[PDB]
């Protein structure tokens, strides 16, 4: 059985609370059994246990910044799996803070995970600051 893993890099967008990602720089996409779809979700073909993670750095000034790892399974309403919530910095022009989320979850065939934030325009996209991935156990 092949190894199944993905690691994708944060991408800015002028558009939504949903973060966008790209297969570029030092990314991982081991095969077509996981795919980055519409730039916004990792969709797995195979059922099973996966370790799923996201790393978000944001730069804000001054209610908390909240990042949520979410799941949409076929035939189900979307749900929150994990969330992390940090107060805004008062540093000027903005203050950087980072959130890391991760855990082990059973996914169904065709399930997709994505990351939402309270303010996507505050996300830091410099090299390595914000990323999203998974590995099948």
């Amino acid at each position, epitope marked *: 059985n092949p190894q199944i893993a993905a690691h994708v890099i944060s991408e*800015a967008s002028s558009k939504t609370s949903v973060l966008q990602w790209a*297969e*570029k720089g030092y990314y991982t996409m081991s095969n077509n059994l996981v795919t980055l779809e519409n730039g916004k979700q990792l969709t797995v073909k195979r059922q099973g246990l996966y370790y799923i993670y996201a790393q978000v750095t944001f*730069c804000s000034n001054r209610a908390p910044f909240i990042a949520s790892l979410c799941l949409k399974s076929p035939g189900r309403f979307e749900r929150i799996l994990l969330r992390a919530a940090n107060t805004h910095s008062s540093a000027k022009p903005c203050g950087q803070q980072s959130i890391h989320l991760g855990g082990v979850f059973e996914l169904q065939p065709g399930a997709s995970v994505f990351v939402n934030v309270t303010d996507p*325009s505050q996300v*830091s*996209h*410099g090299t390595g600051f914000t990323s999203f991935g998974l590995l099948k156990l």
Partner: antibody
Amino acid sequence: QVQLVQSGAEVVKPGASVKLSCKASGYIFTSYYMYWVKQAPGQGLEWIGEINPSNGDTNFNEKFKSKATLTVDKSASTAYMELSSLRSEDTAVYYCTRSDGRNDMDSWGQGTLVTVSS
Amino acid sequence: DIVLTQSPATLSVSPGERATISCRASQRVSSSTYSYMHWYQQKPGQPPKLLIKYASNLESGVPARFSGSGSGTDFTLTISSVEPEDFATYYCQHSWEXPPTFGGGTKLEIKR
């Protein structure tokens, strides 16, 4: 129409600093990253760095991290680049340019010529 | 950093002739869905103007005679039939990683 208007030419001495402006109109200034790009005499293009006008977050090319300070004034829809410790090798046209998704550079300022000479 | 080498340095063509220029990257800048390579036109005394984004997408407002193609390390820009306003220098630029970098340019020159 999306438009970027830069400040006029500078002629300065070595050791001086200059502060260039880039006034944006025709779109929501906070929704797009702003890049600054250098083009030297007879020269090619080099990216200096970027600013997120929504929060002031910046990232730089290692080659320019010492040389360039990037800021914005949201209310005036204006981006600024300060160049410090100027030397003759900094003589160039400097551009601001809007970036769509921090990928392509889809609208450019007219350029500001900076000539440094004793 | 990634190095972009454009060929030829100068391409001489007439109006009504097809022009194709190429851009070779020091590493691949394509993945599953997209190629992170873009193309620009620049005339003396003026800013560059975006022509083609993500290797093959015509920028809004750019005439239909411009197209792009390629993948991995190798990209081309084609002007299907040159018009007098097209004589200019053309640049490729990638957006794979920090810093974005540009090629050295190809001058599209008037053949005589």
